[PDB]
């Protein structure tokens, strides 16, 4: 196969090869130096004069006299099959579990394709996360993208790890046959430290969560382009298991801030003039091409569900990273520093949280039929309980009536009991049972978002 | 048609050489796959082509060929009940041809070439034809689709196809010129389709919903924004106008949407009912639909393709309702292109064409006498959609610097269960002044005053819950407990419109006049009652509050008698309270 030796220029991550009209734009290439060491790159531009290759690793060692480029493949593709479960790969999807390299039933363009809008399907079934604040209030529904908004310091890894261990499909609540219903987790970690990798592995093994997962682990010290590829690898394997194998897949992407931080970098190093608050102008589109690879489709039993996870730079929900993710994804879960001191975990406060696809995933045949209303009440009664806290806050305590005293103690214990569950795996029923014993603190006529009868069932 | 090759490829940008005599903005076909693109630059013997789709895999040296024409839309029978992407490709046919995912370089046709249409000719040989005139007719669902002479074309008719069943490809009419006219013509989307004459906002756009009809109304062909924030019922309110508006056709362009937001439209719409016919509303709607990850260029054409399509249906002499949602997302798309065209970012994260263009689009709205002589309109209802909840968006400014009304939705009102969740203090109408003649003429000599009296009680209700807010309701003079309690009555019995209700789902100006007049009648009989030593609480016990209450639920036909009797009952029930 051809070697291209006409290298005219190397600077930063770029190398230029003359007489390479036969390299396709976007082609993955191999690059060998005098020492014999081999290195990846990608054709990012091509003309009659030369091709610009963007090198994957450092550029140290390359020269213009003993360096040759060659085609590895015209489009970045991925060796994929359904035997990737229990496995554990890296950025580029080569094995890291000390197990054997695997045999693929197809090689897929890791860039994927947009789903045809007309071929989609309103997401309808719920996914039990085991966290009450998620499950009852902000339900993750199959086909959704619902990210966790966290903070440097805050324990997203733990939540990530937890939903990964706990999550499950509830066929017995939908009558559904369990056969066309295998449930898998595609974990994609971007720019993690060895300390956190150690953790996620430990966590996936500890209770065998590993056997039904495919890990795409990427470290902080890896060549940055591997970070850009990780979410693509993951979603490739996920679209595959989902839309050809009827898997319900849950994709967790931590940490998107590291992703976006890598996206720009690959642009500070490709010349590009930065957009708002200094990330790439097309960051909205790029993220779109990631998050949008989720959903459910007519004529298919399977699904792809995303939980991206992102530490906001200074708890600034208006930062490009969370702001853009916000315009693309379907709500979010937010990690309150406020709940972190009071010793609460998982620090998820329901009022800034929202799951926009929820109302179509709960209810008769999907969960329990009080669900929707109970969730709204639970909201209502916390919003109503929080706004009293503000009324009797900084200046003088005890400026309160009888009733509003009782919407008050419904906020204290809604934290201690509902929000603060530690590492309990709570089924939707147990979540609705606690919800109901939290509600019944209020008198009957105050549960206004609930049909009169439901009350009498679960209230007494 | 010019025949060059690829000299360079860098992302979606391609340089073709040897394309001699290629022209600015002509559509190109790029690479062996024939990917569609636009010439954005001519430099010597090269043309910079902006490729609408992913170029990855193309090699220097492949063919590049000019289509010789700028971006255009196909205007003919075949669009209604259709679902196109932002550059007029039928997504249904694509699915069928390629499956669940969208494959690049797929070549389908806006208008089905196989389907047979029932031509009824309306011109004979020797007839003179000018652009815009009706050649003949073809049924499309309920509508009598008119076959139009392209604007720009004219001459004498030589031959005509006899009534029969033809496809859109067939020369139904042929001129002495030799010019063949078909059931469709193409037309460039960035160029306003011509009209004979652009008309004044002296007519109502009848939406069906009282608060916008009575309070913040739009003229026929006017424009209007809505801020569709979550929590408020954007869909529902939007869907209702499509169902109940004095519009013959509804074009809904929406692109740059969340896949499931958008999908919520291709699944919901096919289930709405046309109140005029009893069958689907889809049969008189074109939807252009587009998503986050579908190509930049389509997300930006979207509202233009949609406005041209809208203009075409205008041109046949119908009222056309176009709602684009989301308009901020469109703007996002215009930002990306600007950046891709490597343009230096302007102040406040948008290119400085943003307004201009929001206007090259928005100003194509208008009610007109068409080239065919008929009258028609395009009334636009854009949505401004920033989850940031920031009216500061240069997008919202420019829009609002331009539309003739704003219908401010509010998730706050929704939470209270007030529907449709539009805010009377935030919203407004610019058309109001010049619709009063029509009003006095078509509703009642004393329309404006009555609606003025209502918005007047509203302000006052609004500025009383404010001095109840800081001094308690005890400090309220008698006339206050009343003002608040009718402000109440108007909220619950006049601003609230049940959208899923078989009657209240719609209300016309006449019924809206009645429900108004009753409130103010009741009001001024209470006004003279408290002044006379009658208990406001006894006033508030009167069983004719319920004749008011349950009025919006009464058949439109049964209302005139309901009004006449209830108006008579306000007298007797108040005269009884000596």
UniProtKB/Swiss-Prot annotation, chain A:
Q: Give the source species.
A: Thermus thermophilus (strain ATCC 27634 / DSM 579 / HB8)
Transmembrane region(s): none
> What does the sequence similarity comment in the record state about its family?
Belongs to the ATPase alpha/beta chains family.
GO BP terms, alphabetized: proton motive force-driven plasma membrane ATP synthesis
Q: What gene name is listed for this protein?
A: atpB
Q: Which Pfam families match?
A: ATP-synt_ab, ATP-synt_ab_N, ATP-synt_VA_C
- Spell out the molecular function terms from Gene Ontology: ATP binding; proton-transporting ATP synthase activity, rotational mechanism
Keyword annotations for this protein, in alphabetical order, are:
ATP synthesis, Hydrogen ion transport, Ion transport, Transport
Does the keyword Ion transport belong to this entry?
A: yes
How is this protein named in the record? V-type ATP synthase beta chain
Q: What does this protein do?
A: Produces ATP from ADP in the presence of a proton gradient across the membrane. The V-type beta chain is a regulatory subunit.
- CDD domains cross-referenced by the UniProt entry: ATP-synt_V_A-type_beta_C, ATP-synt_V_A-type_beta_N, V_A-ATPase_B
Curated annotation (Swiss-Prot), chain B:
| Swiss-Prot/TrEMBL GO biological process terms | proton motive force-driven plasma membrane ATP synthesis
Q: Which GO terms describe its cellular component?
A: proton-transporting ATP synthase complex
Q: Please give one Gene Ontology molecular function term for this protein.
A: proton-transporting ATPase activity, rotational mechanism
PROSITE patterns reported for this sequence: ATPASE_ALPHA_BETA
List positions binding ATP. Answer: 228-235
Keywords, comma-separated and alphabetical: ATP synthesis, ATP-binding, Hydrogen ion transport, Ion transport, Nucleotide-binding, Translocase, Transport
Q: Which reaction does it catalyse?
A: ATP + H2O + 4 H(+)(in) = ADP + phosphate + 5 H(+)(out)
Q: Which SUPFAM superfamilies match?
A: C-terminal domain of alpha and beta subunits of F1 ATP synthase, N-terminal domain of alpha and beta subunits of F1 ATP synthase, P-loop containing nucleoside triphosphate hydrolases
Record has Transport as a keyword: yes
Q: Does the keyword Nucleotide-binding apply?
A: yes
Q: What PANTHER family does the annotation carry?
A: H(+)-TRANSPORTING TWO-SECTOR ATPASE (PTHR43607:SF1), V-TYPE PROTON ATPASE CATALYTIC SUBUNIT A (PTHR43607)
Per the entry, what this protein does is: Produces ATP from ADP in the presence of a proton gradient across the membrane. The V-type alpha chain is a catalytic subunit.
Q: Which HAMAP family match?
A: ATP_synth_A_arch
Tell me what this protein is called.
Answer: V-type ATP synthase alpha chain
- The source organism is Thermus thermophilus (strain ATCC 27634 / DSM 579 / HB8)
Read off the lineage from the record: Bacteria, Thermotogati, Deinococcota, Deinococci, Thermales
């Amino acid at each position: 196969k051809k070697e291209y030796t006409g290298i005219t220029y190397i600077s930063g991550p770029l190398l230029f090869v003359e007489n390479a009209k036969d390299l396709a734009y976007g082609a993955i290439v191999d690059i060998k130096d005098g020492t014999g060491r081999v290195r990846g790159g990608q054709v990012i531009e091509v003309s009659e004069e030369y091709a610009v290759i963007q090198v994957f690793e450092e550029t140290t060692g390359l020269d213009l006299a003993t360096t040759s480029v060659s085609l590895v493949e015209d489009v970045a593709r991925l060796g994929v099959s359904k035997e990737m479960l229990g496995r554990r790969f890296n950025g580029i999807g080569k094995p890291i579990d000390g197990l054997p390299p695997i045999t693929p039933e197809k090689r897929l363009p890791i860039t994927g394709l947009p789903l045809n809008p007309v071929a989609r399907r309103k997401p309808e079934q719920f996914i039990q996360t085991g966290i009450s604040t998620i499950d009852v209030m902000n339900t993750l529904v199959r086909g959704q993208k619902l990210p966790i908004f966290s903070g440097s310091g805050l324990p997203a890894n733990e939540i990530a790890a937890q939903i990964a261990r706990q999550a499950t499909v509830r066929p017995d609540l939908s009558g559904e046959g369990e056969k066309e219903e295998p449930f898998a987790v595609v974990f994609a970690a971007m720019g993690i430290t060895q300390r956190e990798l150690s953790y996620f592995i430990q966590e996936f093994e500890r209770t065998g969560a590993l056997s039904r997962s495919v890990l795409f682990l990427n470290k902080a010290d890896d060549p940055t382009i591997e970070r850009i590829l990780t979410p693509r690898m993951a979603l490739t394997v996920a679209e595959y298991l989902a839309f050809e194998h009827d898997y319900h897949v849950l994709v967790i992407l931590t940490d998107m801030t590291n992703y976006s931080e890598a996206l720009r970098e690959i642009g500070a190093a490709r010349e590009e003039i930065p957009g708002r608050r200094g990330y790439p102008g097309y960051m909205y589109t790029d993220l779109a091409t990631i998050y949008e690879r989720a959903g459910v489709v007519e004529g298919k039993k399977g699904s792809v569900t995303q939980i991206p996870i992102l530490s906001m730079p200074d708890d600034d929900r208006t930062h490009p990273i969370p702001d853009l993710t916000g315009y693309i994804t379907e709500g979010q879960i937010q990690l309150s520093r406020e709940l972190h001191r009071k010793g609460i975990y998982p620090p998820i406060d329901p009022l800034p949280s929202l799951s926009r696809l929820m109302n179509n995933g709960v209810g008769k045949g999907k969960t329990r039929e009080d669900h929707k209303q109970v969730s709204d009440q639970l909201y209502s009664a916390y919003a109503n309980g929080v706004d009293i806290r503000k009324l009797v806050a900084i200046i003088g305590e005890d400026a309160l009536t009888e009733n509003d005293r009782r919407y008050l103690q419904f906020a204290d214990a809604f934290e201690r009991f509902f929000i603060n569950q530690g590492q309990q795996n709570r089924s939707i029923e147990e979540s609705l049972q606690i919800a109901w014993a939290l509600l019944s603190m209020l008198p009957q006529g105050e549960l206004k978002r609930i049909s009169k009868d439901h009350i009498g069932k679960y209230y007494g | 048609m010019i025949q060059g090759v690829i000299q360079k490829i860098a992302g979606p940008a391609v340089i073709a050489k040897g394309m001699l005599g290629a022209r600015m903005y002509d559509i190109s076909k790029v690479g062996e796959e024939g990917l569609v693109g636009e010439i954005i630059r001519l430099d010597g013997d090269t043309a910079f082509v902006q490729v609408y789709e992913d170029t990855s895999g193309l090699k220097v040296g492949e063919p590049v060929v000019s289509t010789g024409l700028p971006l255009a839309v196909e205007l003919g029978p075949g669009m209604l009940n259709g679902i196109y992407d932002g550059i007029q490709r039928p997504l249904e046919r694509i699915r069928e041809k390629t499956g669940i995912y969208i494959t690049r370089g797929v070549v389908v046709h806006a208008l089905d070439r196989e389907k047979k249409w029932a031509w009824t000719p309306m011109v004979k040989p020797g007839d003179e034809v000018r652009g815009g005139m009706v050649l003949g007719t073809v049924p499309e669902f309920g509508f009598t689709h008119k076959i139009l002479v392209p604007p720009d074309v004219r001459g004498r008719v030589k031959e005509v196809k006899p009534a029969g069943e033809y496809t859109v490809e067939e020369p139904v009419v042929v001129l002495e010129d030799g010019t063949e006219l078909k059931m469709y013509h193409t037309w460039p989307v960035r160029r306003a389709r011509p009209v004979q004459r652009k008309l004044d906002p002296n007519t109502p756009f009848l939406t069906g919903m009282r608060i916008l009809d009575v309070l913040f109304p739009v003229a026929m062909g006017g424009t209007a924004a809505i801020p569709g924030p979550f929590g408020s019922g954007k869909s529902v309110t939007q869907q209702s106008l499509a169902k109940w508006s004095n519009a013959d056709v509804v074009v809904y362009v929406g692109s740059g949407e969340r896949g499931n937001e958008m999908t919520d439209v291709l699944v919901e719409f096919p289930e709405l009912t046309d109140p005029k016919t009893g069958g689907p509303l889809m049969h008189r709607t074109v939807l252009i639909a587009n998503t986050s990850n579908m190509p930049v260029a389509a997300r930006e054409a979207s509202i233009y393709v949609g406005v041209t399509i809208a203009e075409y249906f205008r041109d046949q002499g119908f009222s056309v309702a176009l709602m684009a949602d989301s308009t901020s997302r469109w703007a996002e798309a215009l930002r990306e292109i600007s950046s891709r065209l490597e343009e230096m970012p302007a102040e406040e994260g948008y290119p400085p064409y943003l307004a201009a263009r929001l206007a090259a689009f928005y100003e194509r709205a208008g009610k007109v006498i068409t080239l065919g002589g008929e009258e028609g309109a395009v009334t636009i209802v854009g949505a401004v959609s920033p989850p940031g909840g920031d009216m500061s968006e240069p997008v919202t400014q420019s829009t609002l610097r331009i539309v003739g009304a704003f219908w401010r939705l509010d998730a706050s009102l929704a939470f209270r269960r007030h529907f449709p969740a539009i805010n009377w203090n935030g919203s407004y109408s610019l058309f109001t002044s010049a619709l009063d003649p029509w009003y006095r003429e078509n509703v009642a000599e004393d329309y404006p005053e009555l609606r003025d009296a209502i918005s007047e009680l509203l302000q006052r209700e609004a500025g009383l819950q404010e001095i109840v807010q800081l001094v308690g309701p005890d400090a309220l003079q008698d006339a206050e407990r009343l003002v608040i309690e009718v402000g109440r009555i108007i909220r619950e019995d006049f601003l609230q419109q049940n959208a899923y209700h078989e009657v209240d789902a719609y209300s016309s100006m006449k019924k809206a006049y009645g429900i108004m007049k009753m409130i103010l009648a009741f009001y001024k009989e209470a006004e003279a009652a408290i002044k006379r030593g009658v208990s406001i609480d006894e006033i508030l016990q009167l069983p004719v509050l319920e004749r008011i209450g349950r009025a919006r639920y009464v058949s439109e036909e049964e209302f005139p008698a309901y009004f006449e009797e209830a108006m008579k009952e306000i007298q007797g029930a108040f005269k009884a309270l000596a």
